[model samples]
Target: GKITFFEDRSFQGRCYECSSDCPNLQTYFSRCNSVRVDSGCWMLYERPNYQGHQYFLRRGEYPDYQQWMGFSDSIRSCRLIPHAGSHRMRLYEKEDHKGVMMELSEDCSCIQDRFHLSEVRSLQVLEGCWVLYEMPNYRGRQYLLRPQEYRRFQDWGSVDAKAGSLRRVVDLY
Candidate 1:
């Protein structure tokens, strides 16, 4: 996997070619104006140590920061996601994986209509990476989840407990 971070828009200026996890890019550049991800998927963070706004990138080129739905103009950290095997997850209607629950290995567009719940307070991720949408049909704000147990909304890095849909991070081919 390969990813290049540019300090100027349209892939210009100082470039940082990274093939591995980079916790902090402060040494190379203050902000990333553009990005190009090749081979595999990557995750960009607005703050150091993988904190702040999250931006997921597949194999493509982003002419500017806004093209990747970035809320801020800075990108402080980045990591390449590995191609994994199978995946599994359990969604709950209440916190700590309580209330009605559903185990799934596929993508979900509407949680309330299918699972009889409109808000997800907690979830137990058994394996793999996933993208959770705040609204149905993959619309609204998104939160990326990896293999872990999110006992509450805070554990998943969100104050809002509404998860309308979920989609696995996998190759379409």
Candidate 2:
């Protein structure tokens, strides 16, 4: 995938094009206000070394920070989310994979109503990667869940286990 980071909104000012993961984007560009994704799905980080707030993006154009729900122009890192054809995951009611378990292969807009769980304390991504939202209908805080077993909530970089929704990461664009 390819993406261009512009220093000013509306694709103006100095810019940098990237085709792979970048740990520190500061050297390539001073600030980021706009982006154009030529292909593939991507994850932008607020801090260097792939840390801090993350914004998921697909093939499209973001004319400003608000377009990607960014809090500022500090885009320090980025990664391309691997494309997957299928999706599967298991949500556990308790940590360490204990308690009620539910297997899902599709998006869940409201986990509480669909899975009968108030929170997902643990989970296992058996197939494609997934994004977990803190609120229903894919809103609020977001967490990326790659294929792996999260023994607890913190494993997915979340301070709490209050996941309200989950969506598979697919190349819809």
Candidate 3:
């Protein structure tokens, strides 16, 4: 199984809303096109907008155990990996706008500074198991299952261990 991840970087320009000169017609005209680079008041736009933008990595197939475990940990620690659950990434937004506007990349191997574990709530393992096979249907549809539900269709006890009954559950890439 294999999964591809996507990431994007973004930026914006605007006048300092908190500045006393804000709302002035001249301020908008002068700063609207100017990229706010000042770390102080000019850096407000660097804040994230959680709703305006979204970053995600989805897996089309199940992954191996080591990959899955590592991916889960990366998500929790905000470490860079090929793919991970939704909770693994960090979200940000402007102070005025509570919406998520952007997400930082965790692929920074040098510092891993963008990785923030506090953002992730939890990790969930879904798809792939003998009890829960998920083969694509006519339109590429897949089904989900649990341990009990999977035992009813096949002789789970007789299933070969080395052969492995939970193919999808074990594979996480």
Winning candidate number (TM-score)? 2
State the lDDT at 99 in candidate 1.
Answer: 92
Tens-digit lDDT track for model 3 on 1-173?
Answer: 22221111122333222222121233222322222121111101111221111112123321221222121211111111222222112222212223332232222221113322212111122321212111211111112222222212222222211111111222222
- For model 1, residues 1-173, the per-residue Cα lDDT tens digits are 78899998899999898889899988999888999887677878888988887777878889998888778679999877766587799988888778988888888899888788888888888888887878888776667888999988888676589888887877432
lDDT of 1: 0.83
Put down candidate 2 lDDT per residue, 1-173, tens digits, no spaces: 99999999999999999998999999989799999999988889889988888888888999999997787899999988998889999999999999999999999999999788779999999999888988898877778889999999889988799989998888755
RMSD of 3: 21.7
Q: What TM-score goes with each of the models? A: 0.89, 0.95, 0.16
Q: Candidate 3: minimum summed lDDT over ten consecutive residues — where?
A: 71-80
Model 3 whole-model lDDT (C-alpha atoms):
0.20
* Local error of candidate 3 at residue 156 (angstroms): 17
Of 1 and 2, the candidate ahead on lDDT is 2
Going through the candidates in the order shown, the clash numbers are 0, 0, 21
Model 2 pairs in collision: none
* Residue pairs with backbone atoms closer than 3 Å in model 1 (clashes): none
Q: Rank the candidates by TM-score, best first.
A: 2, 1, 3
